[PDB]
Every structure is written in structure tokens, then in C-alpha cells.
Coordinates of C-alpha atoms and ligand atoms in Angstrom, one line a residue:
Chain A
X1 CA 0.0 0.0 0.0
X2 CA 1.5 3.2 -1.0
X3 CA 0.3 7.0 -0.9
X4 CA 1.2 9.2 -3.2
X5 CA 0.0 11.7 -5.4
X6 CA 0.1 16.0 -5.0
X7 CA 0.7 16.0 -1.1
X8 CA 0.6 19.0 1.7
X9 CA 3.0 19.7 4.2
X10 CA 0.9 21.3 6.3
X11 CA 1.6 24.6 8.7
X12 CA 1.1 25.2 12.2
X13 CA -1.2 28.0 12.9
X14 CA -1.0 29.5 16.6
X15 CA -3.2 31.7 18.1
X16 CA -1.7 33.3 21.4
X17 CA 1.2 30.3 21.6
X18 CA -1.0 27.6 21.1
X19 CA -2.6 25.2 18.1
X20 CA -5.3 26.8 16.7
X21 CA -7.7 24.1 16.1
X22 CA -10.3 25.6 14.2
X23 CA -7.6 27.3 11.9
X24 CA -5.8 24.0 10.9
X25 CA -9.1 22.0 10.4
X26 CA -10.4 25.0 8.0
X27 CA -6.8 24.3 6.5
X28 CA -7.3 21.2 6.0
X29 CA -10.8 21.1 4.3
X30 CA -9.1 24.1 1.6
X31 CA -6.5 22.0 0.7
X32 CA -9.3 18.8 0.7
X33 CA -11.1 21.0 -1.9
X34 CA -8.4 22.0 -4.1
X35 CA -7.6 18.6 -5.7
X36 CA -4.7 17.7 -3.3
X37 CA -4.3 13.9 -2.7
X38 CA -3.0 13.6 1.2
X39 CA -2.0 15.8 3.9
X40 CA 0.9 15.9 6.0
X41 CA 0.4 16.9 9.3
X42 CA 3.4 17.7 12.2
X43 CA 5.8 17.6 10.0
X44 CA 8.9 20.1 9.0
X45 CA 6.3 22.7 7.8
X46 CA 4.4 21.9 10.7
X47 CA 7.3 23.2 13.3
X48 CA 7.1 19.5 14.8
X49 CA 10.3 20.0 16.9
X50 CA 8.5 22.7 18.7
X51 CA 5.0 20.8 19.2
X52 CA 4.1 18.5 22.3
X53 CA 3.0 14.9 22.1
X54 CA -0.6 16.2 22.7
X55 CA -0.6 18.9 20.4
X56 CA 0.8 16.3 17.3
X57 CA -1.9 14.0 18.6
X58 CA -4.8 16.7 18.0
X59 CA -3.3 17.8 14.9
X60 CA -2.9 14.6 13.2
X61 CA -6.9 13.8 14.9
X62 CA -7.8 16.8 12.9
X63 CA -6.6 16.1 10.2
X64 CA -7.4 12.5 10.1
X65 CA -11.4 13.8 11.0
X66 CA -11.5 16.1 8.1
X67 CA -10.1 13.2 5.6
X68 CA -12.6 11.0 6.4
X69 CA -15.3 10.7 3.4
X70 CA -12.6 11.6 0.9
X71 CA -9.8 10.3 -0.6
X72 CA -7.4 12.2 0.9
X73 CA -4.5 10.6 3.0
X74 CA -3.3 11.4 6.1
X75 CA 0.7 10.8 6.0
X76 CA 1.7 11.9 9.6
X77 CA 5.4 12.9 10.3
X78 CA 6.8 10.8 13.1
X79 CA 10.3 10.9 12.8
X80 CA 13.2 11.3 15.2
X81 CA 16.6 10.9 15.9
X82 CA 15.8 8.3 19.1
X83 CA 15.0 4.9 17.6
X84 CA 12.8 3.8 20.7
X85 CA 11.3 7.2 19.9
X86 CA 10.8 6.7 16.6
X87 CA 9.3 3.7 16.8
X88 CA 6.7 5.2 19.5
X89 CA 5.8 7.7 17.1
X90 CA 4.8 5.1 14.4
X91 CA 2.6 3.5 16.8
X92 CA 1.1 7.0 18.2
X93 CA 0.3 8.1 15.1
X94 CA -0.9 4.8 14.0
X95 CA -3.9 4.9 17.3
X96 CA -5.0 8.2 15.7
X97 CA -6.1 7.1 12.6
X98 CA -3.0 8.5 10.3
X99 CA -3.0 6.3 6.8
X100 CA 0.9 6.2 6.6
X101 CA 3.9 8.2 8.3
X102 CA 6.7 10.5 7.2
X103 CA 10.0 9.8 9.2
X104 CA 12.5 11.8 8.7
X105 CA 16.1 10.6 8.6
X106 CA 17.9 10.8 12.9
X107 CA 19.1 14.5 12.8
X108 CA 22.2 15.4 14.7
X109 CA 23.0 12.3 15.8
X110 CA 24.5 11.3 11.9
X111 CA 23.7 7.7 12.1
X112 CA 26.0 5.7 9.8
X113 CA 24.0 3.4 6.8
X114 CA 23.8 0.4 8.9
X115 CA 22.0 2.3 11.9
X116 CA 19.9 3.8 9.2
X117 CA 18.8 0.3 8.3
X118 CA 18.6 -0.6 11.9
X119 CA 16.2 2.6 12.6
X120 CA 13.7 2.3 10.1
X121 CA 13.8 -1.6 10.1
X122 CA 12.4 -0.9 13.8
X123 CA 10.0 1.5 13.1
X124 CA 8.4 -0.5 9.8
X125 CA 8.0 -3.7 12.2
X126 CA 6.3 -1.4 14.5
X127 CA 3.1 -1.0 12.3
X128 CA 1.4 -2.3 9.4
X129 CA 0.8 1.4 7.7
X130 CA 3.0 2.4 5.3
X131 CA 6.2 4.4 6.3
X132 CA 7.3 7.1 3.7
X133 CA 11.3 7.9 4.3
X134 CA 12.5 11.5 4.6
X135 CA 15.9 12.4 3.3
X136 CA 17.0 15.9 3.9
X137 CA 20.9 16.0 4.6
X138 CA 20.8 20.1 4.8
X139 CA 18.5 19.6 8.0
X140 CA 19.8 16.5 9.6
X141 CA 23.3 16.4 8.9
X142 CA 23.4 12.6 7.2
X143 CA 22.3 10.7 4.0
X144 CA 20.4 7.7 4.0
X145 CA 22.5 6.1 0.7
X146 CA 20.7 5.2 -2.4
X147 CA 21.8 1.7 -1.4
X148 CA 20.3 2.0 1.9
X149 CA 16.9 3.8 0.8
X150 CA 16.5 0.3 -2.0
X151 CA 17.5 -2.0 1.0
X152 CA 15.2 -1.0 3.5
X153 CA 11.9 -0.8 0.5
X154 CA 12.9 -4.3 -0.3
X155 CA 13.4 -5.7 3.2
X156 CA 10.5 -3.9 4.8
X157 CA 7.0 -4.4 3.4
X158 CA 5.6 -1.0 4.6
X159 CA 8.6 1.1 3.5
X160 CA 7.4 2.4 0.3
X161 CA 9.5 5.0 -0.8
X162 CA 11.1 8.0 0.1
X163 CA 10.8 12.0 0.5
X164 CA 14.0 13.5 -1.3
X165 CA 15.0 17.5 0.0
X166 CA 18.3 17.3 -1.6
X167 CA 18.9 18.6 -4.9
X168 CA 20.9 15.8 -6.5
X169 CA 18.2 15.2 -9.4
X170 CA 21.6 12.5 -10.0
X171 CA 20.4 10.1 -6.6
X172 CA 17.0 10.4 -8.4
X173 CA 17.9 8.8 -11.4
X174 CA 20.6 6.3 -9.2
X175 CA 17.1 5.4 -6.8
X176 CA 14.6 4.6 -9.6
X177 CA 17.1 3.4 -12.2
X178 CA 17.8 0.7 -9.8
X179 CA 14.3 0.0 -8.3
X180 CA 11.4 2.0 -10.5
X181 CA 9.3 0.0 -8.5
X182 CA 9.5 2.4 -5.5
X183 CA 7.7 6.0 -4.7
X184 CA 10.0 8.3 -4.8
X185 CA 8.3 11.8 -3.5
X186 CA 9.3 15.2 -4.4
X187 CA 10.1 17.3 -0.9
X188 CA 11.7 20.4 -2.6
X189 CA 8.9 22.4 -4.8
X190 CA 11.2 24.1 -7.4
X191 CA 12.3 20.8 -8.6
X192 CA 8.7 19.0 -8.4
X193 CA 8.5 18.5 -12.3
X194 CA 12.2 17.3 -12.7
X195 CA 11.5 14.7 -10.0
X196 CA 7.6 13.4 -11.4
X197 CA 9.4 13.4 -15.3
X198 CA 11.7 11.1 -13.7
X199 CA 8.8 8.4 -12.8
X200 CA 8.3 10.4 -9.3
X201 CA 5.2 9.4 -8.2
X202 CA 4.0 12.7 -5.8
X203 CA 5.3 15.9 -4.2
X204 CA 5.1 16.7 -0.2
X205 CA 5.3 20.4 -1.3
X206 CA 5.4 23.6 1.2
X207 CA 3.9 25.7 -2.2
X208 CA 0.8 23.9 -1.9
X209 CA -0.2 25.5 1.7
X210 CA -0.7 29.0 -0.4
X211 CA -1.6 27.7 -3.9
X212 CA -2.9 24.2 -3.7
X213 CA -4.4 24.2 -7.1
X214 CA -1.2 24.8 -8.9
X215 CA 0.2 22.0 -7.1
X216 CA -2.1 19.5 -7.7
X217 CA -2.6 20.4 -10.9
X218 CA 1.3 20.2 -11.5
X219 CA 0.9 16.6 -10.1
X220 CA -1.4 15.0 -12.1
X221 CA -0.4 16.8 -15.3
X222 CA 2.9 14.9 -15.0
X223 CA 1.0 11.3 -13.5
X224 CA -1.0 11.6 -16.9
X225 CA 2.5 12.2 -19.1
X226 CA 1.4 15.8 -20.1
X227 CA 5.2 16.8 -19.1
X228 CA 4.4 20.0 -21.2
X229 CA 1.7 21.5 -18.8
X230 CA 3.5 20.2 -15.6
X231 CA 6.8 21.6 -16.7
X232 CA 4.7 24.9 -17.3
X233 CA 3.0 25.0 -13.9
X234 CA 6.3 24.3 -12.4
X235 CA 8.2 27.2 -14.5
X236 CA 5.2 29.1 -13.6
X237 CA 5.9 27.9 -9.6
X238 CA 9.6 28.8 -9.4
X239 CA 9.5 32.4 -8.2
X240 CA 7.1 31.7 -5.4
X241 CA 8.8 28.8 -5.3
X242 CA 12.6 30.2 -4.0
X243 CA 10.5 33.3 -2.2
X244 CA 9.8 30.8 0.1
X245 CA 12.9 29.4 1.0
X246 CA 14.8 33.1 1.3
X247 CA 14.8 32.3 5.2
X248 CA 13.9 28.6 6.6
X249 CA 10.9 26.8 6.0
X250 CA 8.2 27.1 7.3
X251 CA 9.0 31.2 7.9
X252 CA 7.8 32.3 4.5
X253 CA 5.5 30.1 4.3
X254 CA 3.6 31.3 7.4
X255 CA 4.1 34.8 6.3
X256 CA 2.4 33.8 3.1
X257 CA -0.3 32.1 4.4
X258 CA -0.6 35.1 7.1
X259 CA -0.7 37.9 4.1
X260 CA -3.5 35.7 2.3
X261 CA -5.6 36.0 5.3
X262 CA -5.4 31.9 5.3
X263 CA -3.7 32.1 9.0
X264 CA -4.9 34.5 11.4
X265 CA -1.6 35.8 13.8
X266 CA 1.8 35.0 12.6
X267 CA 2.9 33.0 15.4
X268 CA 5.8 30.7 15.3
X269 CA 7.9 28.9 18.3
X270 CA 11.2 29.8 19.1
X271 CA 13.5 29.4 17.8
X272 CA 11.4 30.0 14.7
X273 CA 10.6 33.9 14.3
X274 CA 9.1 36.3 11.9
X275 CA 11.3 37.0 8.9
X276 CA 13.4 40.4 8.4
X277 CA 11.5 43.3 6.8
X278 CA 12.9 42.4 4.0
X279 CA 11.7 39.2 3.0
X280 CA 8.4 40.3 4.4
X281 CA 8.5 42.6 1.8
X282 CA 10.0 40.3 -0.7
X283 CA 7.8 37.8 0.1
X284 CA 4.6 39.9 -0.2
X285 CA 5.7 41.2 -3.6
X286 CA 6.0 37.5 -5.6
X287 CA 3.0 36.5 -4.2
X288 CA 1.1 39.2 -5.4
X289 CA 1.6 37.7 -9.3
X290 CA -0.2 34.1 -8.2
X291 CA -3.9 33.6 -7.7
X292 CA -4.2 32.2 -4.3
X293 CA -7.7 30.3 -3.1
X294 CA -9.8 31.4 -0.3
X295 CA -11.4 29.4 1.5
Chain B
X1 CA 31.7 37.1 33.5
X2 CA 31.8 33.5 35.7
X3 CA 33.7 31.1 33.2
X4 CA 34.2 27.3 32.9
X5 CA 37.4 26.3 30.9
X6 CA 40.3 24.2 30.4
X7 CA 40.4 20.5 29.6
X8 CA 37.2 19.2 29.5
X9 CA 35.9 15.7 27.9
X10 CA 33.0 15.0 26.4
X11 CA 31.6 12.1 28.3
X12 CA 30.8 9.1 26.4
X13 CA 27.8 7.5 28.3
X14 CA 28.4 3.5 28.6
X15 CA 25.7 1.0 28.3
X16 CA 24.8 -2.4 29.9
X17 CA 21.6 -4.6 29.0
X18 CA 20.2 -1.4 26.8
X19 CA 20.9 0.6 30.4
X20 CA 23.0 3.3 31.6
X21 CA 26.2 1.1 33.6
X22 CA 26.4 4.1 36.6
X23 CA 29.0 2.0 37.9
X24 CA 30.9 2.1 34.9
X25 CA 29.9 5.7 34.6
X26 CA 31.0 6.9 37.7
X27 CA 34.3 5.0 37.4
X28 CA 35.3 7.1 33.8
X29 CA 34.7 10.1 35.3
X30 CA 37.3 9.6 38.3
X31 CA 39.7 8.2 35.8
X32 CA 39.1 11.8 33.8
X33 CA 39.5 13.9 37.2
X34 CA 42.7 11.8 38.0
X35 CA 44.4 12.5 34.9
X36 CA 44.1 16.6 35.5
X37 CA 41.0 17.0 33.5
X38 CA 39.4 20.4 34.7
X39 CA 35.4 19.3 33.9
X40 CA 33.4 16.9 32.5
X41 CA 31.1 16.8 29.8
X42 CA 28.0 14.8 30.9
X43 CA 24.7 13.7 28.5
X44 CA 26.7 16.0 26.0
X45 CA 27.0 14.6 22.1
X46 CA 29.3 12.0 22.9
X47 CA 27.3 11.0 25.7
X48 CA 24.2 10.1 23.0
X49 CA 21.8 12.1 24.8
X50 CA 19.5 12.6 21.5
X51 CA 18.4 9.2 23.3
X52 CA 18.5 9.1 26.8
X53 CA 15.7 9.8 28.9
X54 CA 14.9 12.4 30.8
X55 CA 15.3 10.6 34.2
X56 CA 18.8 9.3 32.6
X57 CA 20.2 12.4 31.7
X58 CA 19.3 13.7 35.4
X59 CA 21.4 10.4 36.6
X60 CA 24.2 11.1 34.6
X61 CA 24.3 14.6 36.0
X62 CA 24.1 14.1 38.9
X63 CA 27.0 11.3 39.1
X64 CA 28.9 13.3 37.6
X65 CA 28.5 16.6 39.8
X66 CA 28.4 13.9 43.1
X67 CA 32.1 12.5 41.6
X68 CA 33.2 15.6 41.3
X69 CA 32.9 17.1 44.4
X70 CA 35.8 17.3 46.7
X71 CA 37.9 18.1 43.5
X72 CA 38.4 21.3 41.4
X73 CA 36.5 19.7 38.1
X74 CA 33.9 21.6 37.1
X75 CA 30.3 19.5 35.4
X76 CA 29.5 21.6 32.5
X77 CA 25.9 19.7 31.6
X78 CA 24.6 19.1 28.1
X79 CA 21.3 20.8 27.9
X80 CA 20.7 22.0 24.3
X81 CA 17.5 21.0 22.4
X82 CA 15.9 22.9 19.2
X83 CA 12.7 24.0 21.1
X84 CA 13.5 26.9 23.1
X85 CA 10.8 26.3 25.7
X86 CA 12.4 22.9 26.2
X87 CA 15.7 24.0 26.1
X88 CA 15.0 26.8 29.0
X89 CA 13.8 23.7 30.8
X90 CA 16.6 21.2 30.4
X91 CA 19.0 24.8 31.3
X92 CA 17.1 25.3 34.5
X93 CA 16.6 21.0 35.2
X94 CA 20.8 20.7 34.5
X95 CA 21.3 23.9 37.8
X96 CA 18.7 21.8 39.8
X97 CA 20.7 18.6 39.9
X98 CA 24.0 20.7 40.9
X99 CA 25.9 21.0 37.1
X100 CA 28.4 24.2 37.4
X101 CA 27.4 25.1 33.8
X102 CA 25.6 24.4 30.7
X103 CA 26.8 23.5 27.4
X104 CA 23.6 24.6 25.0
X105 CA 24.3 22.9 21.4
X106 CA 22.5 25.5 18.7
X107 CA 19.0 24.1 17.1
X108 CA 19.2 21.2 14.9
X109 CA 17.3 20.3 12.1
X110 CA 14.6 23.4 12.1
X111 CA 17.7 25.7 11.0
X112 CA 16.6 28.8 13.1
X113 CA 17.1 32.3 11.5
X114 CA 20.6 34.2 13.5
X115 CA 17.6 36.2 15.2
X116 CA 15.7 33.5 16.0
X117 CA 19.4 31.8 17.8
X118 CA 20.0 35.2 19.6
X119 CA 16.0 34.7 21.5
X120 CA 16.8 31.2 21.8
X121 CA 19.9 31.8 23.9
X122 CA 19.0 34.7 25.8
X123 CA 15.5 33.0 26.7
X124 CA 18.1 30.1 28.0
X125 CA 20.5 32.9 29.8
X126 CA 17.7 34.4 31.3
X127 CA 16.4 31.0 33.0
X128 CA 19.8 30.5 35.2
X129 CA 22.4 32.0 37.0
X130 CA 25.1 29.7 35.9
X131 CA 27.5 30.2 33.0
X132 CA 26.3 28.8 29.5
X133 CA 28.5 27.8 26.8
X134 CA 27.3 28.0 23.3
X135 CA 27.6 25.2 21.0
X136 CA 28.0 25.6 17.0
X137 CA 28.9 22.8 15.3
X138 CA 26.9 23.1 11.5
X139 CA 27.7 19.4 10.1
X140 CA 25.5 18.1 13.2
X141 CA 22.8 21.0 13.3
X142 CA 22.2 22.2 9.6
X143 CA 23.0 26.0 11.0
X144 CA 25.8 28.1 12.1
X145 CA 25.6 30.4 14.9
X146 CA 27.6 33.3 13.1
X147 CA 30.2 35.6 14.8
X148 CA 28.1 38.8 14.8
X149 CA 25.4 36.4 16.6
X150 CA 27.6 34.8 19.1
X151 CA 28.9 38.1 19.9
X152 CA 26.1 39.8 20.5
X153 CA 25.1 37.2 22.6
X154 CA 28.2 37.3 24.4
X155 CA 27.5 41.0 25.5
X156 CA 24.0 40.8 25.9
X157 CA 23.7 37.8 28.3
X158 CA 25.7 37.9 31.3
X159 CA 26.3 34.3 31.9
X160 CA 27.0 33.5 28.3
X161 CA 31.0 33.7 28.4
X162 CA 32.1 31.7 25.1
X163 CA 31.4 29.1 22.2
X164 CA 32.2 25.7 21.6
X165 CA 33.4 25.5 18.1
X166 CA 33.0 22.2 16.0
X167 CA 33.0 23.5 12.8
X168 CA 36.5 23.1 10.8
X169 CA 36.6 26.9 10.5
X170 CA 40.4 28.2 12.0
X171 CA 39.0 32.0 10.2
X172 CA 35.9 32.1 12.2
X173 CA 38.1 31.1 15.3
X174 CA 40.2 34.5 14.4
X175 CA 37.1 36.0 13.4
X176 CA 35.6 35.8 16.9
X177 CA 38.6 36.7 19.1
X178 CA 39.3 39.2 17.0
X179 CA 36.1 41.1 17.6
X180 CA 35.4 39.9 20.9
X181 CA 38.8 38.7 22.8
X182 CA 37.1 38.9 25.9
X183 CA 34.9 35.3 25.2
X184 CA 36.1 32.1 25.7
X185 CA 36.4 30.2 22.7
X186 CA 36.6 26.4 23.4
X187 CA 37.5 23.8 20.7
X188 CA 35.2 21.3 19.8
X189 CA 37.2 19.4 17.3
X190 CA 40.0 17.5 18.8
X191 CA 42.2 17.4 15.6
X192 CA 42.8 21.1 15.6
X193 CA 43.2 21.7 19.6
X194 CA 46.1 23.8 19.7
X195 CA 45.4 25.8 17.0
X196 CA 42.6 27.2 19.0
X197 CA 44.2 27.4 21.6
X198 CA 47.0 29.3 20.0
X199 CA 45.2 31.5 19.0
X200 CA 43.5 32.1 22.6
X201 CA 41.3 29.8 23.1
X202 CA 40.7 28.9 26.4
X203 CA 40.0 25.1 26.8
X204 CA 38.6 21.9 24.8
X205 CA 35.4 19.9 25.1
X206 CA 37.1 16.4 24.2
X207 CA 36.4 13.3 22.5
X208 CA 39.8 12.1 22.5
X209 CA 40.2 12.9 26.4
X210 CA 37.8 9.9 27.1
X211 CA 40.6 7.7 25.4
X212 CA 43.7 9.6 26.3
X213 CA 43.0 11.7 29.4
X214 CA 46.7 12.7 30.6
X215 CA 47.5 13.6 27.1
X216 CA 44.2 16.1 26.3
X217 CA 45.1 17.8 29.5
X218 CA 48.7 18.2 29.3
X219 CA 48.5 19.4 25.9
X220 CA 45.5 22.0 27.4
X221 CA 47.5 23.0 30.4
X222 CA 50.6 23.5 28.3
X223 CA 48.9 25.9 25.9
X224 CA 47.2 28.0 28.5
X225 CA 51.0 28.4 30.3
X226 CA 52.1 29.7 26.6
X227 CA 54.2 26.6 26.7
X228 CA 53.0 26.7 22.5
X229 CA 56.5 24.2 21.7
X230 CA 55.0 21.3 24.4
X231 CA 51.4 21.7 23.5
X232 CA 51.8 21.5 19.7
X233 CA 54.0 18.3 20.1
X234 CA 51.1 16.3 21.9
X235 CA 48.4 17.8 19.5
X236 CA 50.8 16.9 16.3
X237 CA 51.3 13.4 18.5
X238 CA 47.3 12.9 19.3
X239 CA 46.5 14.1 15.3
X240 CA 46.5 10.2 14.1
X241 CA 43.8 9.5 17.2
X242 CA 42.4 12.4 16.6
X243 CA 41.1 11.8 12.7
X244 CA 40.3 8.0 13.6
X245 CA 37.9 8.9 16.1
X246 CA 35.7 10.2 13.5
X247 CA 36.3 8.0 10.9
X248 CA 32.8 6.9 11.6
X249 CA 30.1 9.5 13.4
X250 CA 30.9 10.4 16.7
X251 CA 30.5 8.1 19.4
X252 CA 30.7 5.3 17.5
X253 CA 34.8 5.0 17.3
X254 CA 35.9 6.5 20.9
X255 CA 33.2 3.8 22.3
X256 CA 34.6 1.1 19.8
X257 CA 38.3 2.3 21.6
X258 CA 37.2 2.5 25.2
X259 CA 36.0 -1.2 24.7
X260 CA 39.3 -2.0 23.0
X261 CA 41.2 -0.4 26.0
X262 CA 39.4 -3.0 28.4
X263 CA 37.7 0.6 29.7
X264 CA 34.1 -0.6 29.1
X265 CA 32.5 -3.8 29.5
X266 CA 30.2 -4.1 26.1
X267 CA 30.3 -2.0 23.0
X268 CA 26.8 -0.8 23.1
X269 CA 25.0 2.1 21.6
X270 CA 21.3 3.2 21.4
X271 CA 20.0 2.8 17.6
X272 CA 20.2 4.8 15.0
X273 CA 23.8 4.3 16.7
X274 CA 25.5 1.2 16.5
X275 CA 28.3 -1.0 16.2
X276 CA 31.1 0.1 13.4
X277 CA 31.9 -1.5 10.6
X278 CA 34.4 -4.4 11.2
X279 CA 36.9 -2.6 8.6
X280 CA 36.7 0.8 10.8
X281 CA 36.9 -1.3 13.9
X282 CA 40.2 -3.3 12.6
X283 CA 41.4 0.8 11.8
X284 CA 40.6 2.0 15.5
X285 CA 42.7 -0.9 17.3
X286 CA 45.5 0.0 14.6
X287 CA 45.8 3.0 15.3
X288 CA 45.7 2.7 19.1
X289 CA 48.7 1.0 19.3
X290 CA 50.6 4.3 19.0
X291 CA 49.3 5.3 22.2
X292 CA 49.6 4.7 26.1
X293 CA 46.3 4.7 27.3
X294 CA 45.8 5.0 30.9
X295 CA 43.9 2.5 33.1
X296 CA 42.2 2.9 36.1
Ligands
LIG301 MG1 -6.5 11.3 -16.9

């Protein structure tokens, strides 16, 4: 069993320091209604180093509560750099309904390959949902290898692909050259079509929080071979693309979404702030050029 | 500003049955102390505290602080994290179980903006009234705490009095001092100690030290009596050590050498660590014959 398909990584909202329920289940339901294919709740977007066990158990129960009656996935990030936690996570998010989980590669810790194999071999034998690997080396200071990423999707029946934040369109051929059969999942926006041309199979895109839409239309565009209109929704994409990596993810994002009028305070956890003046301002002047849903 | 330097290691944080060995613990530390280490590093990145408990890391603290008492060593606690509100907490849980100082590593993995590092640290400085040592190594944490930050940081927190440095960069290390020769810049990366300390640095935070005690701290001592000739001889001695002690992640080779040396029991780690590869092990017990390694 595998999700995939034009995926979210959904935000945070806070209102006064805490999760503001109503806000991320309204969230939810927009991005329901503009064609994407599965959420992905306390993730990287979703400022999970900063969130508490109980508030990734009520985001992931909202968002698992307003997927129900659709087709949309709930892929909950439950990664961490502690096996033993790791593998709690899978199970937690497991009891609350999540279809599948995002873990992302240990960070800090730079695990070699084999305790990469040893990690997510305990987490997949932990569940029965499938487990989507995260690999984003700028963040977490290692690489799960090609050769690991093939080992652990044919050694693990729930491992069905993996997440790849890292630029090297070369470990994208190297992954699916040597198993096409898994999902390999687009977590870096500005290179979504590259990855899908490639036989990627989905995007877990920070773009889509502001323009869902695009995204999704990008997606399936490429899943049905029109490479022509996916290419040009992603050309279209770049600008806003970069705007919102000029400081960390999710920052601009958050600013976006605040400037839409989709979040209402822009609230982040330390050590996660508002962005300078200036990529306020930079940020509200490329969005300004994209059409961005309502609600 | 109240300061902690010198020699200081990096405590790696043996295992037994999947458990802490507090035994084994306590009796590392004492061996550290009696080889003219100046403070220990306890539940710090070589003590794998990304996956001890909470009740563990309070353990390891407060052996350490209890073993040190009665000597001059210092317990400069591990207590970073990359939520502020939980890394105020760990600053203000290391001062209730008696640790001298804190040693705050900057956010992982969410790569915080510089302004979003200078609240994180001054929400920690602002929690307790004990000295707190940055920590910027970017290969571990994705982010780099830059000098204008650390600075600023420096001057604007009273009990912030330095950085531990871990990140390959001898310009930044002339970068900071230059600007701001009042901090105490600590080395992080055992390969290059004396060339921070040569260029006034004040102490080390050791990996090496858990293998080679005597030799961290003489080299250390000598550098900070401007004995530069003696200090750069051990460091030029220790560099083979030095580089194979990393040649897998950090604590995967000092651990595989501290078993070698008969100075822990099992070689056990908690996944995603584990057990090096039996090439890299065959490496570590070669190049440990170069060295006298100090028992009990
Ligand atoms: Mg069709």
C-alpha cells in the first residue's frame, strides 16, 4: 500500500502560543477542496520539533477527522533521531487514525548506513501502515544512501519510498534506475516537475499550503504524461517557489499564508521567528503575481 | 563574566543490558578527574543524549556533579534542544541537579534564523544563573551560529561567556577573538586543539580525552602556560587519534576504543547508533597502538 499523489505539508497556525484548532481544520478542508491527494500533518512545515505529544496527537486527529469521506491521506510525520522514539511515534500516530507516516532521517545524531537500516527496520516492524522515508541531509546532517533507501523498500514491506530534500536530481535517477518500482516523493517544490518526469510518483510540497491548485494540478499533469503543462505549472511555480525558501521553511511560508488571510496571527515557536522586513517585503511582492484560493 | 574552561571531555555514556552502567559511569569520570582533567562533559553529544531519557540524563548529572565534588573539576551539563521552551527547561533541570554550567548545542534540524538563535539563547541565559557555553557545530545541526550572533550574545547575556566550536573553520576562530577577545572560545574538534588554543582559546570539550586523558590535559594546560613548543607536540602526536575517532560519526569510534582499551565492558550504543563496521573497527585498534592509554 503506498500514498502518493500531490501532497501537503501542512503549517502550524498559533493563536496566542497555542494550536489553533479551528484554523488547521479549516486548513485542511481548503486543501481537501483543491484537488490535493493527502495531507501531512506535524511535519517540517508543521514546526514539529517545537510541538508537544498532545498537540501532534490533536493535529494529526484533525486532520485525520477532516479526511474521512474523501480520498485524501493522512501521512503523519513521526520521525526522530531516538530509535525507541521513533518507533513510538509510528505507533502514536498509528492509534490516531494516520494512513501512513513520514519519518525523517535521525538529525544530529549522523547515524552511519547500517544504523539507518537498523532505525527504520524498527520503526516499519512497528506498524502495518506504510512508512514514507524522509531524506534531507541540509536539515539533519546525514544521508540515508541510495543503497540503503533500495535496501530497507525491499526488506521492509511498509517502506514504500522516500521523501527526497536534496537537490541531487543525479540520486533520483541512481534510486529509480535501480528499483522504479518504489515512490519516490518530491520534498523540494522548485524541482517537483524534474522529480515526477523522472517516474516520481508525488510531491510533499510547502507551495501547496498558499496555492494548492497549482500544485495539484502540476501533479497529475505529469501522472497523466502531459510533461508540457507540468513543466509549465512548475516554471510558472519557481519564483514563489525560491521566495519561500529566502529564510527557513516554514517562515515564509507562514508569512504567506498570514498575508493571504489563510492564518490569522503570525505565530511561530522559538526558535522559529518572523522574517526580516525584508523578506516580508520580498515575500509579499511574488506572491502578489499568483492567484491564491480562499477558503 | 563567571567562566568554565580548560580540559574538558565529552563524556561518552556507557551501556549495559540497553541501560546506563552508573557504575561504569561513575568510574570514567574519576579516571578523567585523575588524569588533570578540569570538567566533564556529561549527556553531551558523545554521551548520546538525543536518546537518553529524561530521568537518565538527570542520573548522569548528577553522578557526575556527586564525583566531582571534593575536586576542582567543574560538570559543564549538556542541555541543548531545538525547542526553546524545552531547552529553558533542560538549562534550569541541569542547575537543579548541581551542574556548574551548561553547554547549549544550537538548534538542529529546524535551522533557526541568526535572530531566531540570539532569543533562543538569551531565553536560556535568562532562566539560570550559571555560566552557559554555546555550542556551534553546522555538520551536526544544519545551522551556524555566526560571529556577529555569538557576539552579540556574548554581551548581551551575562552568563553567556564563550562558544564551543565544532565547525572546521580556524577563520571564524580569528574571526571571533578578533572582535570579541574577551569570550572564551573552546575547541570542539580535537584534531585542531592547539590551533585554537594558539590563537586564545581557552579550553577543549574532548572526545579524544575519554581515550587519552593525561595527554588532552597536558596538551591544554601547556597551551594555556604559553608553553605553544609542548602543546603542539602532543596535539601533532594525538593528530593520528584524533582523525580516527571520527572515521565513523561520533561516538561510534571513541566507544569502539574505550571497549578495545578493556575501559568498558560491552560495545553498546542506542540505535540509530550502533556498532562500526568491522573494517573501521580493525582501523581503531590499529591506530591505538601508537598510544599509552591509561587504566584505572
Ligand atoms: Mg487522466
Amino acid at each position: 500500500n503506498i500514498i502518493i499523489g500531490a501532497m501537503t505539508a501542512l503549517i502550524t497556525p498559533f493563536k496566542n502560543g497555542k494550536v489553533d484548532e479551528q484554523s488547521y481544520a479549516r486548513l485542511i478542508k481548503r486543501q481537501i477542496e483543491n484537488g490535493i491527494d493527502a495531507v501531512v500533518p506535524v511535519g517540517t512545515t508543521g514546526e514539529s520539533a517545537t510541538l508537544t505529544h498532545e498537540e501532534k496527537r490533536t493535529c494529526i486527529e484533525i486532520a485525520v477527522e477532516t479526511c474521512k469521506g474523501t480520498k485524501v491521506k493522512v501521512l503523519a510525520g513521526a520521525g526522530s533521531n531516538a530509535t525507541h522514539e521513533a518507533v513510538g511515534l509510528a505507533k502514536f500516530a498509528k492509534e490516531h487514525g494516520a494512513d501512513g507516516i513520514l519519518s525523517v532521517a535521525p538529525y544530529y545524531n549522523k547515524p552511519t548506513q547500517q544504523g539507518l537500516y537498523e532505525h527504520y527496520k524498527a520503526i516499519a516492524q512497528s506498524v502495518d501502515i506504510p512508512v514514507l522515508l524522509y531524506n534531507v541531509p541540509g536539515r539533519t546532517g546525514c544521508e540515508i544512501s541510495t543503497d540503503t533507501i533500495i535496501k530497507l523498500f525491499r526488506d521492509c514491506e511498509n517502506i514504500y519510498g522516500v521523501k527526497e530534500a536534496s537537490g541531487n536530481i543525479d540520486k533520483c535517477v541512481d534510486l529509480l534506475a535501480h528499483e522504479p518500482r518504489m515512490m519516490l516523493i518530491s520534498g523540494e517544490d522548485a524541482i517537483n516537475y524534474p522529480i515526477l518526469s523522472n517516474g516520481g510518483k508525488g510531491v510533499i510540497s510547502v507551495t501547496s499550503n498558499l496555492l494548492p491548485d497549482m500544485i495539484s494540478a502540476l501533479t497529475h499533469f505529469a501522472l497523466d504524461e502531459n510533461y508540457k503543462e507540468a513543466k509549465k505549472i512548475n516554471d510558472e511555480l519557481y519564483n514563489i517557489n525560491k521566495i519561500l525558501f529566502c529564510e527557513s521553511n516554514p517562515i515564509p511560508i507562514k508569512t504567506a499564508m498570514y498575508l493571504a488571510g489563510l492564518i490569522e496571527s503570525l505565530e511561530f515557536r522559538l526558535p522559529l521567528c518572523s522574517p526580516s522586513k525584508e523578506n516580508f517585503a520580498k515575500i509579499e511582492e511574488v506572491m502578489k503575481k499568483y492567484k491564491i484560493k480562499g477558503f
